[PDB]
């Protein structure tokens, strides 16, 4: 049991140093396999790409002094740093939502009292590492025992959610700016509908090429082959698509070009810890706590969940977790980048699942029957940094990149926001208020309980992921870490009551 | 046995009529069912289009002589009478291809040989009549007990391929007419893609709705009363699509207004046997025999081996067939409406067949394994002569008729042809020339044959059907049906000695 108590300081450390590091060849070793660059082909796309979108939306929200060179560089330096020396190199980190969120309103804050944008995150960043540190001695990273799967289940299901309806919404707005009527462009004919259509052919060939893997047809070692390279050959065949027509006018890909910060006028590469212009406030100095608390929250709950998700027993992980190092690395590089200007980051989600299961192996035959078991997951170090790497070399090519429409990396996000749901008995208990009662599998948690029971279950778990969805929604979306947490004693409280022993075994069980 | 000769002169046609007609209100019983109201909806439009399109090129061809409103009139008299008085009314008649080869190298001939064209196609008529008169009478017919599964297949195959190709070639000039530029409408923009997407939503649609009916969500009965109206589905929600829509420019549907002749000028509806403007010389009077042979042969071809196809035994048709009756209705319906200028008209394979399994009903439960065997056809002589009526009167309305596209029907062709090629032993063979001779199923001619020789069986069918569709793309393509008769020899000289006596009765199985 990883998540003990062992009642010494930093015990937990030490047991997951022991526990890891000895399987550290074995994780270059087992880089050598195809399957490993087509994960790194694919998911090389999936990291550029969010970090110019919320590189853009950062510089517009601030007064251009964090852009998207700055949020390349701590993506890649913190990437290469994790994933040479953490416990979990299945994970993927990056900005999210929340951290765009939180900076958005820090800077508003200190506009509105007239205090300085780049040295109140310093002090915000020393309060984190401090945090981080005391946490790490005390062993308080043993409250994850309490997260059950009530909680999983619904983070998992709101963020592919939030994922899809994003990329389905930045479709909109290319119908919106360039309108069918006929007679930074704007206007233009042909090509709000040669977006779509880019974006569904992306899509289409992608599932096909999926769905061709499991097929019967070819020698099994071609086909394999061939399915595991599917999102490289759909992008490929697109994006010469769209190279042969040479009048319409699409949306590409846009790097940033040389290592240079975006306003180079007023702010430097490293920023003094105290005041760079005018004398910092003394009462800033210890204030500055409050939002440390907050932000440690975002990224312990955001970082602790994935890592609890992509570890199910289901999925064959054997060199083991760590719920301690990677939460102390996580948290003291973010510390310490904060002192440069550079963001703070926290795991992926979306990223780091479909990164786990892209190098997932299944059982092949045996016999006719139900679709395949996973067999093993094949954990390495080289995947993640050769990733990160790559994201930090981006800058010198991209003559290149620029050859790369958007609606082609659209229809690779939908596939991933669609592939991402499948596992999750949320997900799977939503198909069964559909079938008739008759037609339900032989799975445990359909003989144990009744139907009705199962379906009020899943209609109380459902009003809270509404409830959550709201609270985003609306402009107090600050507090949506504290909601997520409020589930657990939701659970510990008032659905024991509801529910008898037995019901509760069977519809939340561990494994 | 139909096919048996019984000595007595017109023995065949009382044996039909004897067997087939004691079920006359039965078939106007069976009519009662949500499933022959879809199978009408579905079927009017894809009897419909064709006669325009068909009736466009022959206006083209001719001087004007033979257009739209003559082919629309002759479609309804023909397919009233046929459906009426016929022995398979699962058989939809009407214009073809090699019908509108042949009249085109007849008009060239009577204008390069100054003679009349109208007054020309009176005598074939007659002579028509009297062969098939002639061979009614000796009980000709039942030599179609030589057209063995080797030519069924071929036939099938060559005509469902044909069917996609057209329909995907008529979406290209759409692409040549209206390019992708930007700045009898000529030139637009948002025109050539917006027949793409349309197209392309109608086809999913209907493939979505068509796999939804075997699923297994919702209760019983509406999911299958939902399943067996998709195309309407489908066809309504593209046409409501494509109306919101206001200011890009589509291809509507046109038909003629008035029941009225194309070329009053100079034409009428009753056409003088003997001349018309000047007399007609008697040695084409009795030369006349010549094409009647050629155009005999077309329609015996084709009518008797769509026949052959829909009445299978796997098919569960209990009502019986009609190999005599059916030939005769169709020939001496074309030869009298010979005399009025109207067109003749055979039986329509892809239309016939996509009646026959709009039709069928399957079977469940169990546990998913083969494709659920087919537990009845459903019969009925209510369906064919509905669809024709409805074809008639479609020039009354016409103020709908206008505001449907032309792409939205394309998609449902392709599915059309798609769908068709379900349950011919060629199609399946096919795919057993890619799977791993370990994945091959449990039929007769996989166990009881040597795979080699089944490779070897497909690559000769290949030949022949890539030689058959040679001859049509050849300006010679008025001796298809030779080259098809051709077949039946072949089976019985040559792949009688190449093939051992095994092989051949597990290969060309009869049921």
């Known amino acids: 049991?990883?998540?003990?108590?062992?009642?010494?300081?930093?015990?937990?450390?030490?047991?997951?140093?022991?526990?890891?590091?000895?399987?550290?060849?074995?994780?270059?070793?087992?880089?050598?396999?195809?399957?490993?660059?087509?994960?790194?082909?694919?998911?090389?796309?999936?990291?550029?790409?969010?970090?110019?979108?919320?590189?853009?939306?950062?510089?517009?929200?601030?007064?251009?002094?964090?852009?998207?060179?700055?949020?390349?560089?701590?993506?890649?330096?913190?990437?290469?740093?994790?994933?040479?020396?953490?416990?979990?190199?299945?994970?993927?980190?990056?900005?999210?939502?929340?951290?765009?969120?939180?900076?958005?309103?820090?800077?508003?804050?200190?506009?509105?009292?007239?205090?300085?944008?780049?040295?109140?995150?310093?002090?915000?960043?020393?309060?984190?590492?401090?945090?981080?540190?005391?946490?790490?001695?005390?062993?308080?990273?043993?409250?994850?025992?309490?997260?059950?799967?009530?909680?999983?289940?619904?983070?998992?299901?709101?963020?592919?959610?939030?994922?899809?309806?994003?990329?389905?919404?930045?479709?909109?707005?290319?119908?919106?700016?360039?309108?069918?009527?006929?007679?930074?462009?704007?206007?233009?004919?042909?090509?709000?509908?040669?977006?779509?259509?880019?974006?569904?052919?992306?899509?289409?060939?992608?599932?096909?090429?999926?769905?061709?893997?499991?097929?019967?047809?070819?020698?099994?070692?071609?086909?394999?082959?061939?399915?595991?390279?599917?999102?490289?050959?759909?992008?490929?065949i697109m994006v010469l698509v769209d190279y042969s027509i040479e009048d319409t006018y699409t949306q590409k890909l846009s790097v940033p070009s040389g290592f240079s910060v975006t306003a180079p006028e007023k702010r430097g590469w490293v920023i003094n810890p105290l005041g760079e212009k005018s004398p910092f406030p003394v009462w800033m100095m210890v204030a500055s706590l409050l939002p440390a608390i907050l932000v440690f929250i975002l990224?312990?709950?955001?970082?602790?969940?994935?890592?609890?998700?992509?570890?199910?027993?289901?999925?064959?992980?054997?060199?083991?977790?760590?719920?301690?190092?990677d939460l102390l690395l996580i948290v003291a590089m973010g510390g310490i980048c904060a002192l440069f200007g550079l963001p703070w980051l926290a795991a992926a989600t979306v990223r780091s699942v479909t990164h786990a299961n892209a190098l997932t192996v299944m059982s092949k035959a045996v016999a006719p029957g139900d679709k395949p078991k996973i067999q093993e997951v094949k954990e390495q170090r080289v995947t993640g940094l050769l990733v990160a790497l790559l994201v930090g070399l981006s800058i010198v090519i991209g003559d290149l990149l620029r050859q790369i429409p958007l609606a082609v990396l659209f229809g690779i996000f939908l596939y991933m926001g669609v592939t991402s749901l499948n596992g999750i008995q949320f997900y799977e208990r939503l198909h069964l208020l559909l079938m008739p009662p008759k037609h339900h599998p032989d799975v445990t948690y359909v003989k144990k309980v009744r139907t009705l029971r199962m379906h009020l279950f899943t209609a109380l778990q459902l009003l809270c992921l509404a409830l959550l969805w709201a609270v985003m929604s609306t402009a107090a979306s600050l507090a949506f870490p504290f909601i997520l947490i409020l589930t657990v004693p939701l659970r510990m409280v008032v659905l024991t009551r509801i529910f008898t022993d037995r019901e509760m075994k069977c519809l939340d069980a561990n494994e």
């Not at 050598?32 to 970090?51: G, K, R, T």
């Not at 990224?299 to 190092?325: D, N």
């Open 299 to 325: 990224i312990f709950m955001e970082t602790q969940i994935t890592t609890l998700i992509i570890s199910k027993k289901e999925r064959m992980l054997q060199k083991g977790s760590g719920f301690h190092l």
């Open 1 to 236: 049991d990883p998540l003990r108590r062992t009642g010494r300081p930093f015990g937990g450390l030490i047991r997951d140093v022991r526990r890891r590091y000895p399987h550290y060849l074995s994780d270059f070793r087992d880089a050598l396999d195809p399957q490993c660059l087509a994960a790194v082909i694919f998911i090389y796309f999936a990291a550029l790409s969010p970090a110019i979108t919320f590189g853009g939306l950062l510089g517009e929200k601030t007064q251009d002094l964090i852009g998207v060179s700055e949020l390349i560089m701590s993506t890649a330096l913190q990437g290469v740093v994790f994933c040479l020396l953490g416990a979990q190199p299945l994970l993927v980190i990056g900005f999210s939502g929340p951290l765009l969120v939180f900076e958005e309103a820090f800077f508003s804050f200190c506009s509105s009292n007239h205090l300085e944008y780049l040295v109140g995150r310093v002090w915000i960043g020393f309060w984190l590492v401090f945090l981080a540190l005391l946490m790490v001695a005390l062993e308080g990273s043993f409250l994850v025992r309490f997260v059950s799967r009530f909680t999983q289940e619904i983070f998992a299901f709101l963020i592919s959610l939030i994922f899809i309806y994003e990329t389905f919404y930045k479709l909109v707005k290319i119908f919106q700016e360039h309108p069918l009527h006929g007679c930074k462009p704007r206007g233009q004919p042909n090509t709000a509908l040669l977006s779509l259509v880019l974006m569904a052919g992306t899509f289409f060939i992608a599932f096909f090429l999926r769905k061709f893997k499991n097929s019967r047809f070819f020698p099994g070692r071609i086909r394999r082959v061939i399915g595991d390279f599917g999102v490289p050959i759909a992008i490929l």
